[PDB]
Every structure is written in C-alpha cells, then in structure tokens.
Amino acid sequence: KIEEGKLVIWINGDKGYNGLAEVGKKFEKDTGIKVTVEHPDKLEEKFPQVAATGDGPDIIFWAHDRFGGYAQSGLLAEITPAAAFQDKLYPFTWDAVRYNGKLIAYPIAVEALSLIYNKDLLPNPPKTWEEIPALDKELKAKGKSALMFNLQEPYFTWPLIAADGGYAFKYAAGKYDIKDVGVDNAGAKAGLTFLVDLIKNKHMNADTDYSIAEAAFNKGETAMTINGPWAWSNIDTSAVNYGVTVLPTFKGQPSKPFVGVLSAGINAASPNKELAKEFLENYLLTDEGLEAVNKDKPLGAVALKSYEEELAKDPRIAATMENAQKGEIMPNIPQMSAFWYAVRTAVINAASGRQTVDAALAAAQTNAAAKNVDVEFSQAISYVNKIKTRFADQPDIYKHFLEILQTYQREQKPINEVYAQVTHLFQNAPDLLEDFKKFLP
Ligand SMILES: OC[C@H]1O[C@H](O[C@H]2[C@H](O)[C@@H](O)[C@@H](O[C@H]3[C@H](O)[C@@H](O)[C@H](O)O[C@@H]3CO)O[C@@H]2CO)[C@H](O)[C@@H](O)[C@@H]1O
C-alpha cells in the first residue's frame, strides 16, 4: 500500500534524520511531493517483512551489509545511474552496493569505528588493548574509568574479535565461502576472551550499552569510548575535548573494524521510483544535501568526491579512514544477518558468564555457517535409528513423519506448527523433538 505521489524514507535513529528531512522539504517545495522521514526501531528487520507484501518505505537507508539479503528477496529496485553520475562517487563505494552484477542502492557515506578519547584525562591514548587493565586501575584511583563502549551490539566488539584472526566469511578470490566461517577459530577465541576478562576484572560492565557509554564519556566519567562519526556531534556539545584515533592493537595486530557504507535503497514495490532517483541523485547526493545531513549527525567519509575532498581535511575523518584501511569492508551477501545474530548471542552469553567463550563461539559458528550436507545426512540416519529404538510397534510412524515434512513444503505450514506435529507424533519422549530442530531451524 505504498502511496503514489509521495516519498516515505526510513533511516536509523542515530543518523541525521532531521537534516535529511530538510533535504526533503527542499524537494517538496521544488516538486510538490511530500517527503516523510521516519526512523522506526529495528527498521532493518521490519523492512523485509513489509516490503515482501508491497508495503514499507519508498527508500530505506542502512549500511550495505543488509542490502544483499533484501535484493536476493526481490525487495530492491535496480539502480539506474547514468555514467556521469557514477563518476561523482568513489568506485569502491559503488562496489559495496553491487550484488550479482547489479547496483541495488545509492552509497552515501563510509563508516568505521574509531577510538575516541578524552584529551584532558588521557593526552596520549594507549596503543594496545593489553595496557588498558592497568590504565583503568590508575584511573579508578582518580575517580574515573579507562574504557566504556556498547557491549550489546557485535559491531562494536568485532574489531577486537577479528584482530588476532577471527573473520565472518572466508573471501576466496571474488566469492565469499558461506561454509568457511571464522567465528570460533583461535583468533576469535583470543579476542573474545580478552573482552570477557576485562568484564571479569571489573574494567568493564557487561550491561553497558550505547547510551550508557555515550553519557559516561560525554560527562567526563570515562577516558575512552569506541564509536562512529555519528557520535561526534553530541560530544561537541558536551565540553569534553576529544581526539579520534586508531583503535588499539591486540597481540600486536590492529583491530579490524567492519567498515559500513551507508546506503539508500529503493523499494521494488514503490510506485515512485523516478521520484526516489531524482531525490537521491539530484538533492541528497550533492554538496548541499550531504552537508545538511552531515551538520545534523556527521556521516563519516561521504561517497561524493566533491564533498569528501573538503571533509577529508578533518583529522577525525582521516582517523576514520585509517581504521577502515586496517579493517575490512563488510560483505553484503544474504548470510550477513545470520552471522551478526550469531555473534551478538555469543558476545552477550560470554560477557554475562552464562557460557564460556569456547561454548559461545562454537554455537555461533554453527549458527553462522552453512550446513555440512554430508554431516546432516549422517545425523538424519542416526535420527531414523532413534525412531526405531522407541517406536518398533508403530510401523506407520515413518509414513506419518514424511507426510508432516511434505505438507510443510506443500502447504506453507509454519515451522513451529511443524514442531508441534513432531512432538505429538513422537509422544513418548521429547529427545526426538530436540534432535529434529537441527534439521529444520
Ligand atoms: O546484533 C544484531 C543485529 O545485527 C545486524 O546489525 C548489524 C548491522 O547490519 C551492521 O550494519 C552494523 O550496524 C551498525 C551500523 O552500520 C551503524 O551505522 C549504526 O550506527 O550502528 C550499528 C551497530 O549498532 O552492525 C550491526 C551488528 O551489531 C542486523 O542487521 C540487525 O537486524 C540485528 O538486530
């Protein structure tokens, strides 16, 4: 039910949506087309649900890592920029929004996490993660803390996890191997273990989130934080004098932040694709438009060459790009969301103590990696054997088992309803219910 003759835009609540709304108001005056900018929570999760039936915004803003999943699901229109417009943007940013040979979004800005530190508490920031524990002890004797940052989102903890060898998907010459995940190798384990020890030795608190960390840094309570360029404007208001620098090294190796490219995608079900392209190309992606958003919340290093050549003179931008060079630009493949969900659970479970690092990351490795088809078939054989162990007197049990799985596909049965059908059929014991979940998660 996307209405024709208007533009509805979704953008995350930490970006400069008020500045984006002003670009929209200039668009409305020139064209008569009302532009509405909304920032719903979890918009990156709501968009696949509403767009699939033809609803949702005309334009969705998010980092490029979500967009490949959207495109594979037929939710994004293909971008049709003339060659002259494409030359206005850096080629590596166009690469970030390319999926299966097609441009599926307009890139806006390059984002990378940096180390933000209080120059009146810490004139020289630490070069290594390893010295932070003793630095915290010295600062705790002066009524301060060393480091506070968002421990709830794996975006913020991944640079340390990846530093010694962790990775999301192995890049093998032009394709990401969705079967080669590096979430439970020795490097990822060493990085998450340093994180959990920081919490264990009371240098960080597992409950710290984005807002707790931002308030503590902007009040001068903690000497360091980890954040992106969108956070700089609130620090400008705070009276804290801060520097933006390269993240600390772990085991002598640089932290590797996942680099995001903020991108605007056009809903495939939108009846306003021409209006969306005009707004994005001729209003937002200009010096005038980006400055309007950038003055609300800084965007990072923008994709537009003309505006970025002036933004690159900021040492905070130069530090952002230095951290980007040491990190890796994110894959956009559809498997990214499962990777992020798996790592979020692992960090949270390990940080709180509910699981060891090794257990937490082994479960995340299985959740993020594609199935080993030879392994699962052997488990299917073991599962069949288990049925015969407990139901030797029910010769029709396999016929009814297959019927459930067939009807699942033929009639679009919800998965949890399939689960109830399995537990009722195997009414004797629920081990067959637990064993079944792996085959259909
Ligand atoms: O943790 C569960 C969430 O995992 C996924 O979110 C990813 C994003 O897809 C990824 O872009 C990055 O988000 C950051 C974003 O780039 C930045 O502009 C914003 O200001 O900060 C974000 C970090 O909070 O990292 C997160 C993972 O932390 C998934 O898409 C999302 O639905 C899950 O809820």
CSV table of N, CA and C and ligand atoms in Angstrom, one decimal, residues 12 14-15 42 44-45 62-66 70 111 113 150 152-156 210 227 230 258-262 330 336-337 339-341 343-345, ligand 1:
chain,number,residue,atom,x,y,z
A,12,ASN,N,18.0,5.1,10.2
A,12,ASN,CA,18.2,4.7,11.6
A,12,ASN,C,18.2,6.0,12.5
A,14,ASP,N,20.1,7.0,14.8
A,14,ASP,CA,21.3,7.6,15.2
A,14,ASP,C,22.0,8.4,14.1
A,15,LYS,N,21.3,8.5,12.9
A,15,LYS,CA,21.8,9.3,11.8
A,15,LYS,C,21.1,10.6,11.8
A,42,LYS,N,14.4,-1.0,14.8
A,42,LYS,CA,14.5,-2.2,14.1
A,42,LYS,C,14.0,-2.2,12.6
A,44,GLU,N,15.6,-2.2,9.9
A,44,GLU,CA,16.3,-3.2,9.1
A,44,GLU,C,15.7,-4.6,9.2
A,45,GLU,N,14.9,-4.8,10.3
A,45,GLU,CA,14.2,-6.1,10.4
A,45,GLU,C,12.8,-6.0,10.0
A,62,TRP,N,20.3,2.1,5.2
A,62,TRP,CA,21.0,1.3,6.1
A,62,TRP,C,22.4,1.0,5.5
A,63,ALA,N,23.3,0.5,6.4
A,63,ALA,CA,24.6,0.1,5.9
A,63,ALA,C,24.5,-1.0,4.9
A,64,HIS,N,25.4,-1.2,4.0
A,64,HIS,CA,25.3,-2.0,2.8
A,64,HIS,C,25.2,-3.5,3.1
A,65,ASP,N,25.6,-3.9,4.4
A,65,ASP,CA,25.6,-5.3,4.7
A,65,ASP,C,24.2,-6.0,4.7
A,66,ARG,N,23.2,-5.2,4.9
A,66,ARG,CA,21.8,-5.8,4.9
A,66,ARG,C,21.2,-5.9,3.5
A,70,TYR,N,18.2,-8.2,1.1
A,70,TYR,CA,17.0,-7.6,0.5
A,70,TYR,C,16.9,-7.9,-1.0
A,111,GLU,N,31.6,4.4,6.9
A,111,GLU,CA,31.6,4.5,8.4
A,111,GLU,C,32.6,3.4,8.9
A,113,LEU,N,34.5,2.4,12.9
A,113,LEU,CA,34.7,2.7,14.3
A,113,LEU,C,36.1,3.2,14.6
A,150,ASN,N,29.6,0.2,23.8
A,150,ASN,CA,28.5,-0.6,23.6
A,150,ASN,C,28.8,-2.1,23.5
A,152,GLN,N,26.5,-4.4,23.7
A,152,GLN,CA,25.3,-5.1,23.3
A,152,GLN,C,25.2,-5.4,21.8
A,153,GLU,N,26.0,-4.7,21.0
A,153,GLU,CA,25.9,-4.9,19.6
A,153,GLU,C,27.3,-5.4,19.1
A,154,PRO,N,27.3,-6.5,18.4
A,154,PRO,CA,28.6,-7.1,17.9
A,154,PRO,C,29.4,-6.3,17.0
A,155,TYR,N,28.8,-5.3,16.4
A,155,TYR,CA,29.5,-4.3,15.6
A,155,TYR,C,30.7,-3.7,16.4
A,156,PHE,N,30.4,-3.4,17.7
A,156,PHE,CA,31.4,-2.7,18.5
A,156,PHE,C,32.5,-3.6,19.0
A,210,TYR,N,24.8,1.4,24.3
A,210,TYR,CA,25.2,2.6,23.5
A,210,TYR,C,25.0,3.8,24.4
A,227,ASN,N,33.3,4.4,19.0
A,227,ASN,CA,32.1,4.8,18.3
A,227,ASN,C,32.4,5.3,16.9
A,230,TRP,N,28.9,9.4,13.6
A,230,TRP,CA,27.6,9.9,14.0
A,230,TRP,C,27.6,10.4,15.5
A,258,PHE,N,34.7,-3.7,11.1
A,258,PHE,CA,33.9,-3.9,9.9
A,258,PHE,C,33.4,-2.6,9.4
A,259,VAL,N,33.8,-2.2,8.1
A,259,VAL,CA,33.6,-0.9,7.5
A,259,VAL,C,32.2,-1.0,6.9
A,260,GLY,N,31.3,0.0,7.2
A,260,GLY,CA,30.0,0.1,6.7
A,260,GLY,C,29.9,1.2,5.7
A,261,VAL,N,29.1,1.0,4.6
A,261,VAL,CA,28.8,2.0,3.7
A,261,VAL,C,27.3,2.3,3.8
A,262,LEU,N,27.0,3.5,4.4
A,262,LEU,CA,25.6,3.9,4.5
A,262,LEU,C,25.0,4.0,3.1
A,330,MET,N,32.4,-4.6,4.8
A,330,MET,CA,31.6,-5.8,5.1
A,330,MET,C,31.1,-6.5,3.8
A,336,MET,N,24.9,-12.4,5.9
A,336,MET,CA,25.5,-11.5,6.9
A,336,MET,C,24.6,-11.4,8.1
A,337,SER,N,23.3,-11.3,7.9
A,337,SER,CA,22.4,-11.1,9.1
A,337,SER,C,22.4,-12.3,10.1
A,339,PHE,N,25.0,-14.2,10.5
A,339,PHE,CA,26.3,-14.0,11.1
A,339,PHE,C,26.2,-13.0,12.3
A,340,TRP,N,25.6,-11.9,12.1
A,340,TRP,CA,25.5,-10.9,13.1
A,340,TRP,C,24.7,-11.3,14.3
A,341,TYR,N,23.5,-12.0,14.0
A,341,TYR,CA,22.7,-12.6,15.0
A,341,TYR,C,23.5,-13.6,15.9
A,343,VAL,N,26.8,-13.8,16.3
A,343,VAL,CA,27.8,-13.2,17.1
A,343,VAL,C,27.3,-12.4,18.3
A,344,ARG,N,26.2,-11.7,18.0
A,344,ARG,CA,25.5,-11.0,19.1
A,344,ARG,C,25.2,-11.9,20.3
A,345,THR,N,24.6,-13.1,20.0
A,345,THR,CA,24.3,-14.0,21.1
A,345,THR,C,25.6,-14.5,21.8
B,1,LIG,O1,23.3,-7.5,16.6
B,1,LIG,C1,22.1,-7.9,16.0
B,1,LIG,C2,21.9,-7.0,14.7
B,1,LIG,O2,22.8,-7.5,13.8
B,1,LIG,C3,22.7,-6.8,12.5
B,1,LIG,O3,23.1,-5.4,12.7
B,1,LIG,C4,24.4,-5.1,12.2
B,1,LIG,C5,24.2,-4.1,11.0
B,1,LIG,O4,23.7,-4.8,9.9
B,1,LIG,C6,25.6,-3.5,10.7
B,1,LIG,O5,25.4,-2.5,9.7
B,1,LIG,C7,26.2,-2.9,11.9
B,1,LIG,O6,25.3,-1.9,12.4
B,1,LIG,C8,25.8,-0.6,12.7
B,1,LIG,C9,25.6,0.4,11.6
B,1,LIG,O7,26.4,0.1,10.5
B,1,LIG,C10,25.9,1.8,12.1
B,1,LIG,O8,25.6,2.8,11.1
B,1,LIG,C11,25.0,2.0,13.3
B,1,LIG,O9,25.0,3.4,13.7
B,1,LIG,O10,25.5,1.2,14.3
B,1,LIG,C12,25.2,-0.2,14.1
B,1,LIG,C13,25.7,-1.0,15.2
B,1,LIG,O11,24.6,-1.0,16.2
B,1,LIG,O12,26.4,-3.9,12.9
B,1,LIG,C14,25.2,-4.5,13.4
B,1,LIG,C15,25.5,-5.6,14.4
B,1,LIG,O13,25.9,-5.0,15.7
B,1,LIG,C16,21.3,-6.9,11.9
B,1,LIG,O14,21.2,-6.2,10.7
B,1,LIG,C17,20.3,-6.4,12.9
B,1,LIG,O15,19.0,-6.6,12.4
B,1,LIG,C18,20.4,-7.2,14.2
B,1,LIG,O16,19.5,-6.7,15.2
